[PDB]
Amino acid sequence: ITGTSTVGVGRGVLGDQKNINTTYSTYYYLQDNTRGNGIFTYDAKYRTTLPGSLWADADNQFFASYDAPAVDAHYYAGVTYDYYKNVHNRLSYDGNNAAIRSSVHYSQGYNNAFWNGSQMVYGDGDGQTFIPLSGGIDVVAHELTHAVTDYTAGLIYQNESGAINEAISDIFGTLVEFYANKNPDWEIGEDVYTPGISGDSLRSMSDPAKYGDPDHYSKRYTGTQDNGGVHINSGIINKAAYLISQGGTHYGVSVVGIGRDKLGKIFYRALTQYLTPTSNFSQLRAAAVQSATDLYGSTSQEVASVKQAFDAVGVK
Ligand SMILES: O[C@@H]1[C@@H](O)[C@H](O)OC[C@H]1O
Ligand SMILES: O[C@@H]1[C@@H](O)[C@H](O)OC[C@H]1O
Ligand SMILES: O[C@@H]1[C@@H](O)[C@H](O)OC[C@H]1O
Ligand SMILES: O[C@@H]1[C@@H](O)[C@H](O)OC[C@H]1O
Ligand SMILES: O[C@@H]1[C@@H](O)[C@H](O)OC[C@H]1O
Ligand SMILES: O[C@@H]1[C@@H](O)[C@H](O)OC[C@H]1O
Ligand SMILES: O[C@@H]1[C@@H](O)[C@H](O)OC[C@H]1O
Ligand SMILES: O[C@@H]1[C@@H](O)[C@H](O)OC[C@H]1O
Ligand SMILES: O[C@@H]1[C@@H](O)[C@H](O)OC[C@H]1O
Ligand SMILES: [Ca+2]
Ligand SMILES: [Ca+2]
Ligand SMILES: [Ca+2]
Ligand SMILES: [Zn+2]
């Protein structure tokens, strides 16, 4: 909509106050004109028609319970935009400042959130398995990172390539959570999963086995469920990424940690320059090694730590 750029205030799903960029024309709309071609957040009104109505509010104050998922979808899309621009010089998910559109209140009791190829879609959850999923910055950034992948490597969503696709989204979801440095961790979805249970999450990058996911290639799932285990086998790559950043000794292999920023630079270069739609784990290792070589030199600690981490998870 055409209007004046304004700044509203509200509370997100977890009850935290934040400012949001809006546009004023009779109503205040969840339309942020400060980032690329815009960030636009819509009300799906418990239906499955997309995108729904551009979110309108009479007073620029977003403190109602019904507002909270919209506040977070809008704000965390902004954080994700800022991460990719400021850290990686990438303008929106396509690198060409595509508008970022999100719909909240999708369906009823819907325990999922997804990038659908052109926008984000957030369920409200059923209140037991999940609360509204836009409350999780790592979920928001995980799904928007699928769009980054689609516009770069084009990793296929099945078998080893699909597990890489999911790990890339977990890695950057987590790096965005740290960039936004409110309550970061190496867990996925902890803020919105199981409101009745403290200390759990959908999966752990630091210790995949805590939830029964593999932390070594020898433990990879080879069945047909989950598109060949894409959210299961991601644990192998997630653990490697965790080790690259934080270090540790895993199955007897010592890894010297190089920190989050270098992890992000190495994997971003691997994704955008070297991965292809069918890259397997071994090819990801090679891409990460080459990316660290490009950035830091073949004799660098960074290259050595990449190799150590992939060794530790059994990926040659
Ligand atoms: O849509 C308009 C946008 O294009 C401009 O950049 O800022 C004001 C908005 O109304
Ligand atoms: O506690 C939250 C509240 O502050 C917000 O306004 O609506 C959603 C709730 O979860
Ligand atoms: O376009 C909107 C539609 O998506 C929603 O489901 O019902 C109201 C309409 O304004
Ligand atoms: O409070 C309202 C809620 O009861 C309804 O479901 O949708 C709009 C909200 O503002
Ligand atoms: O235009 C392409 C689009 O069709 C696809 O969704 O992602 C890659 C883009 O280059
Ligand atoms: O250390 C920062 C890291 O926490 C963030 O995730 O990505 C950028 C780095 O500068
Ligand atoms: O506690 C168990 C854990 O040790 C294993 O790694 O995965 C399944 C869990 O039930
Ligand atoms: O069966 C597949 C397995 O061969 C591969 O290693 O990882 C993905 C699985 O789907
Ligand atoms: O096979 C790829 C290789 O061509 C490149 O050099 O590094 C990335 C690898 O995945
Ligand atoms: Ca209001
Ligand atoms: Ca997290
Ligand atoms: Ca929980
Ligand atoms: Zn998903």
Ligand SMILES: [Zn+2]
């Ligand atoms: Zn995913």
Ligand SMILES: [Zn+2]
């Ligand atoms: Zn967290």
Ligand SMILES: [Zn+2]
């Ligand atoms: Zn899955």
Ligand SMILES: [Zn+2]
């Ligand atoms: Zn998923």
Ligand SMILES: [Zn+2]
């Ligand atoms: Zn270990």
Ligand SMILES: [Zn+2]
């Ligand atoms: Zn460990």
